[PDB]
Amino acid sequence: ELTDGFHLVIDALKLNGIETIYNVPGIPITDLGRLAQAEGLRVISFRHEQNAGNAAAIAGFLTKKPGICLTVSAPGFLNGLTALANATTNCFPMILISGSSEREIVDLQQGDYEEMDQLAIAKPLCKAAFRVLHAADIGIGVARAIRAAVSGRPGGVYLDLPAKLFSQVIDADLGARSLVKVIDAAPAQLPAPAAIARALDVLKSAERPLIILGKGAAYAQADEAVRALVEESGIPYVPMSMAKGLLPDTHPLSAGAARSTALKDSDVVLLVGARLNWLLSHGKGKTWGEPGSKRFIQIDIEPREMDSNVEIVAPVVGDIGSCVEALLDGIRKDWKGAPSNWLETLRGKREANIAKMAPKLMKNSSPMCFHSALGALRTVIKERPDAILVNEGANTLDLARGIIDMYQPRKRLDVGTWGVMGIGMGFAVAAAVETGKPVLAVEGDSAFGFSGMEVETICRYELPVCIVIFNNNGIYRGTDTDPTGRDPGTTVFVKNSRYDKMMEAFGGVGVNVTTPDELKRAVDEAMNSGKPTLINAEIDPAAGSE
Amino acid sequence: ELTDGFHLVIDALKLNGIETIYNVPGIPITDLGRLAQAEGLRVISFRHEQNAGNAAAIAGFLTKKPGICLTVSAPGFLNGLTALANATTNCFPMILISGSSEREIVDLQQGDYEEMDQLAIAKPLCKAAFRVLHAADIGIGVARAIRAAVSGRPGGVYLDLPAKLFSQVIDADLGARSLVKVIDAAPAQLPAPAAIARALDVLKSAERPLIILGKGAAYAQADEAVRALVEESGIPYVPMSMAKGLLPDTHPLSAGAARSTALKDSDVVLLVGARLNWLLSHGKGKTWGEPGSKRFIQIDIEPREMDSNVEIVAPVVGDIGSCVEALLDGIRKDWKGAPSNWLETLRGKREANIAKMAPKLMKNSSPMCFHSALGALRTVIKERPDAILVNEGANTLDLARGIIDMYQPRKRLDVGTWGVMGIGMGFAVAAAVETGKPVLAVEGDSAFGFSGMEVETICRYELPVCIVIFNNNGIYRGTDTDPTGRDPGTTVFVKNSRYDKMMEAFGGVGVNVTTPDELKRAVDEAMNSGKPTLINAEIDPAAGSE
Amino acid sequence: ELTDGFHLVIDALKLNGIETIYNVPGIPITDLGRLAQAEGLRVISFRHEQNAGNAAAIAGFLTKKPGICLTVSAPGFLNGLTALANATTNCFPMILISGSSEREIVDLQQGDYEEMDQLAIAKPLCKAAFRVLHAADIGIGVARAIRAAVSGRPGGVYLDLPAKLFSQVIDADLGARSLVKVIDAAPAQLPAPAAIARALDVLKSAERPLIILGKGAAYAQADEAVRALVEESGIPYVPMSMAKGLLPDTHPLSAGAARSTALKDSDVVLLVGARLNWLLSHGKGKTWGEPGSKRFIQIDIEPREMDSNVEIVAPVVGDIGSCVEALLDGIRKDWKGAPSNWLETLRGKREANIAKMAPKLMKNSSPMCFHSALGALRTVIKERPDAILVNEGANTLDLARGIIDMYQPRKRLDVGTWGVMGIGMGFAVAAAVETGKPVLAVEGDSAFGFSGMEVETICRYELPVCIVIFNNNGIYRGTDTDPTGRDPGTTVFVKNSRYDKMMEAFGGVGVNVTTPDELKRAVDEAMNSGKPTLINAEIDPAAGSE
Ligand SMILES: Nc1ncnc2c1ncn2[C@@H]1O[C@H](COP(=O)(O)OP(=O)(O)O)[C@@H](O)[C@H]1O
Ligand SMILES: Nc1ncnc2c1ncn2[C@@H]1O[C@H](COP(=O)(O)OP(=O)(O)O)[C@@H](O)[C@H]1O
Ligand SMILES: Nc1ncnc2c1ncn2[C@@H]1O[C@H](COP(=O)(O)OP(=O)(O)O)[C@@H](O)[C@H]1O
Ligand SMILES: Cc1ncc(C[n+]2csc(CCOP(=O)(O)OP(=O)(O)O)c2C)c(N)n1
Ligand SMILES: Cc1ncc(C[n+]2csc(CCOP(=O)(O)OP(=O)(O)O)c2C)c(N)n1
Ligand SMILES: Cc1ncc(C[n+]2csc(CCOP(=O)(O)OP(=O)(O)O)c2C)c(N)n1
Ligand SMILES: [Mg+2]
Ligand SMILES: [Mg+2]
Ligand SMILES: [Mg+2]
């Protein structure tokens, strides 16, 4: 009996638990995707590889298994590579699998069809990259790519399959023996007791301790241990954007609504899978109070992240589950409690800030402003705490992050570390496919334009996605003009563009709403029915910042 | 009070325990090296940066602290980068620090003095690379370089210091607060009990178990735990080249002299800091018996090393110290012992091969052969078990590895994973500088030519190095000729070259020997006196392999 | 009849005029070098690939045909790559040919012998790179490499030959038809008449015109046209270092001895194969007088060199031969003459500077200084105007460049654009091999250490090289000390090292000299006899600058 490279690739993926392939067909991988579908894998075909890649990336975040993006050679590979780079930047496990052309023609730069040394091009832009020349090495190649994607700091891996590989024929028994079911692809890594003891001694010296939960903490799926660490220590916490919901955002220990005071006045800060990068002002400047006022404890699987920005006095290296559980054990044995004055200081700021926002969510101005629209969507998420929220834009992003409380972990998927516009539709597809939950995508109209053709994809697979476009006719605002009076302003779109009518062009439901009540009712009907829906919400073009 | 970039660099290195800088002076780092020496660091200046880089590399292997190599820009940086890449390949911790030119001129490719984007050029060839533009970030830049060099799988890191950096002046108190004394640069990483349990179950099922000790196990400096694992399990072991001496090479559990049988007939193999790369035939082929006859347990800090070549049924990820002690604990609690007939099989094969070799060591040919010369040096090392052996060549390498038993760990420094000719004199310098031990460098005459100029360096610092050149007039052999009769053959050197005269050029002792007894007496005199010595040993040009 | 990869490689090289291979043997190219020698090519084997690479680089400068450097994989390839990058920086045609390992193992990063994707690693560091997978494409691969090396701006090209290539067998007639004898490898490129007209108009407007001859003009081998352009226009000229001797350095139109005045006070400058890089202060600052005082005409084959640093009002793009001849034809038809007052100004400045230098050449100090030693060697070169001068160091370089007049083109080979220490012995080998001329290598003692082992290569091939080491015991000077009193100073060597004894080690002539008369006598004897000779010249350790 004989097998070929086509079947070995699919067999290796199936053996290792891959159930979905995100892709765009074409030479030389169309028949690979057809075979994947015939062998029971779900194959999702997109309108652009970048969106297939974004889907695979967030599938990795949601599941701790590498999402698979399959593309053609050079131009399609480059489209996927952009998403793979973003996956690496965000620590999402993902494998970009791409066909490539004739090795000897490419090696001589003779102008092959879609010629590119895709292995060499990918390496500066992703965590690891491999190329498989022989059918008998497909099993090990897939194993190397899975291990690179999910171990250590997870990230994007490139796997290059030359067209010639797929049609190679080898003995079927030799083939099956060549496959590898990876054992312990993402091993636990436990910290040394001395590192835990040092972290505990710093934490116990704190007068104003603070926990910061990053999306690495959400990714780790150690929800019970993270919640117990916060609740049994009594230490207030601030969630980063995609750690919202790991503990309910309304939790009594959250200082999220008092973030400025917590960051400025704390003295010991425990970072749980959160980098001191631009989102935390690099641990420097007035955001963190006076220089010398902060000691940092940091839990991270990547030892090289310690001392990346400022001195880390108590580095704790290992997987978050192991590290949090070791810390929690120590707190259970010896911990005085968190200082009461500090908690009361933060509770007062939290209540004052919430009270200041509260009237803004109720103001019923016409045109609808960002606050009143998002006040309605806040209620949707409270009523549907298992729904997934996709969110991108500028005002649409920053205001939604502050106003919409999340209640369950890994339900908020947004622009991430690189602040990428364009993840929305790819993320919505993967969220619906991987979780089976309803998806609410809250999109700026500029952000939506980077991936908006994928609404046809959403319709084609009848995915339960409700898209809300905050249509303010522009980037940030819709009011800029050309001072020469000849063209539109550089930051505007066609006024009152009807994105809902675009959705209807592919058979989805389109709604045009102009009030918070209309928005609420339309979202409710979409999420109750599961029908692909796009709601075009008129937002005041002068509202928001900038 | 004010400080400057010059002083901040030296302060940051001193703060983190750097005591030695290997370098070659020149613009823009001559004054940096002078200040290091003025501030009490030992500064070793070489004749070529590649040798200064090799010294730093093996200094990292010997100490588990990054060896520091300091170079000028573009051409000197490239010389050091070749050694940094070799350090990375061998998992040796090392920091290449280079000056670079004017950022704005290099960025526009205008033809600066020694113009090169050294940061961009280094990244494909080493583990990590950083460039420091502002004096206040020197402390963090040094901290990042240190952590990347020694954590995880150790390797070579590039630290780029533009010439303008050194002259920047900042407040001395701000300068001091910006320095970082790295906490736990190389953290312990402990494996999960489930992974150890899996490995123990495989090991207990073995009828013919084998331990392979790689140079990762030697580097880890967990000597007592590694020896206890071998001795208390009773499992025979094979040491890779630079793991020789971790346990005495004459240890009764060593199957090193029955290596071929041990690899072929074992059923369970425990790899301890050793890769299934070309040195172990990729775990494939006749070296390892019949396909499917082997189950591998592998201990390694790098999770991505698992399944690199063949399926690893029991991966154990962590630092070697933590993992071998966890295994040892499990063996102590439940171990039936290694099967006796397996040890008997290997012991018989070991004694038979040692006997086959014994007559070759005493046969006193004329001219001297490799075996009889190396028989004298075997005795030297047996009599001086704390001396360091540097070794490179072809016959001179492979025959010395088999004939010269090592008795203490980390005393054998050789060509390593890339089989590099050229590490000899650099390794000898760092060995002598770092340890204070006598050094015996056993060098092929071709191998020696790659770094031979550094005998002046050895003389200049009065280092206790005894160099033995196995002078067979060529690469592998001295007999090849030009079939056209016009030139020397491509693989020979000047016949009867007297490298001892080259040593005397720099005030060292130079000796010419023709017999094993003359060799033994000359080596004894050199190593007793500690004077820099080069012994030119006349070896039969027709002796050896090839 | 059948042929193989080994033979096709040698056949392709022979077909295109390759007569010499510089190399270091080893797997997988030892048998390739043997076959080359058996088929009549001269094969020069070095002690380190970087020196073989330097030889190939200057062979390209000397001959306008790519020098061939042949190396093993990863570590030897990296050594050669450093010289290939330097060739690219200096615009020297060169091909680095390296063996590489098993493509499928390297592509999976499984740890092949000397594993490296050398194609991908080479590309950021040279002009072009190709890899040849199939024997039938060897002919085209060699054609591609030759064309890339010598066309456009010449430079270094990497040609990768996997080990499996050499033993492929194909039909001998197919093999013969697959070979390519390159037609017009370095085509002439003629400038548009309108660019020449523009340049002539600027030149005719000049009150103080100046020609600058760079080593591109020397490389071009348009000697008669360049000399005619200078002599028939009557415009004074300044030669860059390796354009010295294109016209005799004593030529009445040379302003080389009045360089500062020529650059500062000229108004129109004609660059002929010379970049406004660091060697010409980027066309900025006080070197060039007041801002706005200069108009540049530039002749270069590389259109992208125009406006690299400052605005070029008359760019002329093409090969120097064609462009100089087109300028010359314009001058012959209509030219008023260079203003004779400007020539008078430069003549007076030249005569004053030479008179200020004359006493220092005759000052018979003890110990010998740089000036009195170089005064002797100035006379040597005057008496031997066909000899080749290799020169490197700091004081030994800068003072020799000023003091030693060259009389014939392409006789001065030095550190070049990157200021590399280490080109000396490789350049000397290639000069002697390619030209058959006597070679005088004037070497700093620090500079010599970077390639000094190759004196054995010089002896092995009995090359007419006379090496003079300016032994001042250190870098720039020999007087620096360790302020802690523990070690030698960072910039010194063993005091009164006898490098001449190192030459005796390999059967060459060693001489120690202390006065200019002893030096002159020793050089005369060495260059008269053609015997490989190294003269150790004692230089005052406090003389010179820096
Ligand atoms: N399973 C894990 N265990 C430990 N650390 C992890 C794990 N997964 C990701 N990380 C770390 O979590 C961090 C996430 O940082 P960031 O992406 O900056 O989160 P946010 O943007 O929420 O701050 C990264 O440093 C990554 O190494
Ligand atoms: N402290 C350590 N703990 C665990 N593994 C280590 C440690 N230091 C190095 N290693 C691993 O040891 C291995 C060395 O393998 P190799 O260099 O191939 O040794 P040899 O050449 O002797 O087989 C590498 O896989 C490296 O990741
Ligand atoms: N045959 C040629 N015809 C025209 N320009 C050439 C030719 N060969 C080299 N060049 C140019 O000559 C210049 C040499 O510049 P440089 O190397 O800076 O010379 P120097 O260092 O003497 O100034 C380069 O710009 C290169 O493109
Ligand atoms: C790929 C990419 N391109 C451009 C940007 C810059 N950018 C930041 S926010 C934004 C759009 C903001 O407008 P919108 O989504 O309509 O949100 P609004 O503020 O109007 O609610 C853009 C284009 C980006 N982050 N990513
Ligand atoms: C940098 C580098 N260049 C070339 C080689 C190829 N090579 C392998 S062994 C060797 C020298 C073997 O000759 P020698 O050192 O004299 O040992 P012998 O067998 O003669 O005792 C060389 C050049 C290499 N491994 N590394
Ligand atoms: C590869 C490389 N490394 C380092 C340097 C820095 N450098 C510039 S000149 C010089 C040596 C100067 O000393 P020497 O050759 O003895 O000449 P001297 O002034 O003493 O005559 C060095 C090492 C360089 N140019 N290239
Ligand atoms: Mg908008
Ligand atoms: Mg030899
Ligand atoms: Mg000197």
Question: C-alpha distances in angstroms, C358 versus C353, C354, C371, C398?
Answer: 9, 6, 10, 17
Owner of token pair 């010089």: C458
Chain A residues within an 8 Å CB radius of B317: 151, 184, 187, 189
Indicate the top mutation candidate among A425, A476, A497 to test ligand 4's pocket, ranked by most ligand atoms within 8 A of CB.
A476
Calculate how far, in angstroms, residue A16's C-alpha sits from the geometric centre of ligand 8.
51
The answer to whether C168 and C135 are in contact (CB under 8 A) is yes
Helix (H) or strand (E) holding B519: helix B516-529
Listing DSSP states for B196-227 in one string gives HHHHHHHHHT-SSEEEEE-HHHHHTT-HHHHH
- Give the angle subtended at the CA of A421 by the CAs of A420 and A425, to the nearest 5°: 110
Structure-token pair, residue A394: 């500028």
Could you tell me if the CB of C282 is within 6 A of ligand 3? no
Question: Under 8 Å CB-to-CB from B418, ≥6 apart: which residues?
Answer: B86, B89, B90, C74, C75, C114, C115
Question: Under 8 Å CB-to-CB from C339, ≥6 apart: which residues?
Answer: C206, C207, C208, C209
Torsion angle of the four alpha carbons C131, C134, C139, C143, in this order, in degrees rounded to the nearest 10: -20
Q: Three-class SS of residue C511?
A: strand
Question: Under 8 Å CB-to-CB from A78, ≥6 apart: which residues?
Answer: A116, A121
* CA B500 to centroid of chain Cα atoms: 26
- Give the angle subtended at the CA of A255 by the CAs of A254 and A260, to the nearest 5°: 160
Residue of B25, B420, B482 with shortest CB distance to C475: B25
Residue A542, Cβ density class (10 Å: 0-12 exposed, 13-18 middle, ≥19 buried): exposed
Helix (H) or strand (E) holding C61: helix C49-63
Kindly report the number of other CB atoms within 10 A of residue A42's CB atom: 14
Nearest-angstrom CA–CA distance, C54 and C22:
9
The C-alpha of B125 sits at a distance from chain C's nearest C-alpha, in angstroms, of 8
Taking only residues 95 to 124 of chain C, the set having a beta carbon closer than 8 angstroms to any beta carbon of chain A reads: 103-104, 107-110, 117, 119-120, 123
Nearest-angstrom CA–CA distance, B511 and A416:
68
Query: In one letter, which amino acid is A12?
Result: A
Kindly report the number of other CB atoms within 10 A of residue A355's CB atom: 10
Residue of B308, B491, B506 with shortest CB distance to C494: B506
Structure-token pair, residue C464: 């007419």
Could you tell me if the CB of B427 is within 6 A of ligand 2? no
Nearest-angstrom CA–CA distance, B385 and A438:
71
The answer to whether C69 and C52 are in contact (CB under 8 A) is yes
Chain C residues within an 8 Å CB radius of A100: none
The answer to whether C4 and C169 are in contact (CB under 8 A) is yes
Structure-token pair, residue C420: 């590399």
Owner of token pair 């590119």: A116
| Among A335, A348, A347, residue whose Cα is nearest residue A252 | A347
Chains that touch A (3 or more CB pairs under 8 A): B, C
The answer to whether A336 and A320 are in contact (CB under 8 A) is no
Nearest-angstrom CA–CA distance, A87 and A122:
13
**What residue's CA is closest to ligand 4, atom 13?**
A475
Query: In one letter, which amino acid is A111?
Result: G
| Among C318, C299, C322, residue whose Cα is nearest residue C203 | C299
Alpha carbon distance, N-terminus to C-terminus of chain A: 67
Q: Cβ separation of B115 and C278 shorter than 8 Å?
A: yes
Question: C-alpha distances in angstroms, B533 versus B48, B500, C451?
Answer: 21, 8, 22
Q: What are φ and ψ of residue B250, in 5° steps?
A: -90, 5
Q: What are φ and ψ of residue C56, in 5° steps?
A: -65, -35
Nearest-angstrom CA–CA distance, A286 and A481:
36
The answer to whether B491 and C30 are in contact (CB under 8 A) is yes
Calculate how far, in angstroms, residue C73's C-alpha sits from the geometric centre of ligand 5.
12
Indicate which technique resolved this structure: X-ray
Could you tell me if the CB of C382 is within 6 A of ligand 3? no
Calculate how far, in angstroms, residue C391's C-alpha sits from the geometric centre of ligand 3.
20
Strand-pair partners of B98? B71, B160
Binding residues of A for thiamine diphosphate: 394-396, 419, 421, 446-447, 472, 476
| Among C138, C147, C139, residue whose Cα is nearest residue C93 | C147
Listing DSSP states for A328-369 in one string gives HHHHHHS-----HHHHHHHHHHHHHHHHHHHHHHH---SSPP
The C-alpha of B445 sits at a distance from chain C's nearest C-alpha, in angstroms, of 10
**Sign of the CA dihedral C114, C117, C123, C129?**
positive
Structure-token pair, residue B501: 């005269």
Q: Three-class SS of residue A136?
A: helix
**Chain A touched by B439 (CB under 8 Å):** no
b/e for B235-272, b at 16 or more Cβ within 10 A? bbbbbbbbbbbbbbbebebbbbbbbebbbebbbbbbbb
Nearest-angstrom CA–CA distance, B483 and A413:
72
Query: In one letter, which amino acid is B100?
Result: S
Q: Specify the ligand 5 atom closest to the Cα of B470.
A: 21
Alpha carbon distance, N-terminus to C-terminus of chain B: 67
Owner of token pair 């005796």: C504
Q: Three-class SS of residue C478?
A: coil
b/e for B13-22, b at 16 or more Cβ within 10 A? bebbebebbb
Nearest-angstrom CA–CA distance, C177 and B472:
44
Q: Which of C27, C29, C47 to mutate to test the interface with B (most CBs of B within 10 A)?
A: C47
The answer to whether C263 and C288 are in contact (CB under 8 A) is yes
Taking only residues 471 to 490 of chain C, the set having a beta carbon closer than 8 angstroms to any beta carbon of chain B reads: 475, 480, 482-484, 486-490
Q: Three-class SS of residue A207?
A: coil
Question: C-alpha distances in angstroms, B374 versus A22, A474, B394, B441, C501?
Answer: 62, 81, 14, 12, 28
Could you tell me if the CB of C471 is within 6 A of ligand 6? no
Between C138-150 and C5-15, two packed helices, what is the crossing angle to 10 degrees?
Answer: 40
Chain A residues within an 8 Å CB radius of C103: 103, 133
Could you tell me if the CB of C526 is within 6 A of ligand 3? no
Chain B residues within an 8 Å CB radius of C452: 47, 453
CB-side neighbour CA atoms (13 Å) of B490: 26
Q: Cβ separation of A144 and B183 shorter than 8 Å?
A: no
The answer to whether C92 and C154 are in contact (CB under 8 A) is yes
**Chain B touched by A311 (CB under 8 Å):** yes
Owner of token pair 């609690």: B333
**Sign of the CA dihedral A313, A315, A320, A325?**
negative
Q: Specify the ligand 1 atom closest to the Cα of A90.
A: 17
Strands of A439-444's sheet in order across: A412-413, A388-392, A439-444, A465-471, A533-538, A509-513
Calculate how far, in angstroms, residue B458's C-alpha sits from the geometric centre of ligand 6.
20
Query: Strand C314-317 and strand C412-413: pairing?
Result: unpaired
* CA A70 to centroid of chain Cα atoms: 19
**Sign of the CA dihedral B291, B297, B302, B303?**
positive
Query: Strand B533-538 and strand C2-4: pairing?
Result: unpaired
The beta-strand segments (E) located in A49-116 are: 67-71, 94-100
Nearest-angstrom CA–CA distance, B535 and B442:
10
- In SS3 terms, B140-195 reads as HHHHHHHHHHHCCCCCEEEEEEEHHHHHCEEEHHHHHHCCCCCCCCCCCCEECHHH
Nearest CA in chain C to B74: C418
Structure-token pair, residue C164: 């499996």
Taking only residues 352 to 381 of chain B, the set having a beta carbon closer than 8 angstroms to any beta carbon of chain C reads: none
The answer to whether B389 and B241 are in contact (CB under 8 A) is no
**Does the N-terminal peptide bond of residue A367 adopt cis geometry, omega within 30 degrees of 0?**
yes
Annotated ligand binding at B300? The verdict is: yes
Calculate how far, in angstroms, residue C448's C-alpha sits from the geometric centre of ligand 6.
9
Could you tell me if the CB of B4 is within 6 A of ligand 2? no
Chain A residues within an 8 Å CB radius of B143: 307, 311
Owner of token pair 């540097």: B390
Nearest-angstrom CA–CA distance, C414 and A50:
52
| Among C200, C253, C236, C242, residue whose Cα is nearest residue C220 | C242
Nearest-angstrom CA–CA distance, C400 and C392:
9
- A399: left (phi > 0), else alpha (psi -120 to 50), else beta? alpha
- DSSP 8-state secondary structure symbol assigned to residue C318: S
| Among B464, B460, B448, residue whose Cα is nearest residue B531 | B464
The answer to whether B299 and B316 are in contact (CB under 8 A) is yes
Q: Cβ separation of A187 and B183 shorter than 8 Å?
A: no
- DSSP 8-state secondary structure symbol assigned to residue C404: -
Query: In one letter, which amino acid is A280?
Result: L
Strand-pair partners of C299? C272, C316
Q: How many residues can be counted in chain A?
A: 546
The answer to whether A54 and A86 are in contact (CB under 8 A) is yes
Nearest-angstrom CA–CA distance, C445 and C471:
5
The C-alpha of A270 sits at a distance from chain B's nearest C-alpha, in angstroms, of 16
Nearest CA in chain C to B111: C277
**Sign of the CA dihedral B329, B334, B340, B346?**
negative
Residue of C42, C111, C480 with shortest CB distance to B278: C111
Could you tell me if the CB of C394 is within 6 A of ligand 6? yes
Resolution in A: 1.9
Could you tell me if the CB of B345 is within 6 A of ligand 2? no
The answer to whether C92 and C155 are in contact (CB under 8 A) is yes
| Among C265, C259, C248, C257, residue whose Cα is nearest residue C212 | C259
Strand-pair partners of B99? B161
**Chain C touched by A134 (CB under 8 Å):** yes
Nearest CA in chain B to C42: B487
The answer to whether A136 and A2 are in contact (CB under 8 A) is no
Q: Tell me the Cα Rg of chain B.
A: 25
Torsion angle of the four alpha carbons A521, A525, A530, A532, in this order, in degrees rounded to the nearest 10: -70
Nearest CA in chain A to C161: A107
Kindly report the number of other CB atoms within 10 A of residue B201's CB atom: 11
Strand-pair partners of A511? A535
Q: Cβ separation of B453 and C452 shorter than 8 Å?
A: yes
Q: What are φ and ψ of residue C386, in 5° steps?
A: -95, -5
Could you tell me if the CB of A395 is within 6 A of ligand 4? yes
Query: Strand A314-317 and strand C94-100: pairing?
Result: unpaired
Nearest-angstrom CA–CA distance, B70 and C499:
26
Nearest-angstrom CA–CA distance, B126 and B156:
5
Nearest ligand, measured from the Cα of B242: 2
Calculate how far, in angstroms, residue B518's C-alpha sits from the geometric centre of ligand 8.
20
**Does the N-terminal peptide bond of residue B438 adopt cis geometry, omega within 30 degrees of 0?**
no
The answer to whether A537 and A368 are in contact (CB under 8 A) is yes
Strands of C509-513's sheet in order across: C412-413, C388-392, C439-444, C465-471, C533-538, C509-513
Question: Under 8 Å CB-to-CB from A371, ≥6 apart: which residues?
Answer: A357, A360, A361, A363, A399, A403
**What residue's CA is closest to ligand 3, atom 22?**
C214
Alpha carbon distance, N-terminus to C-terminus of chain C: 66
**Chain A touched by C501 (CB under 8 Å):** no
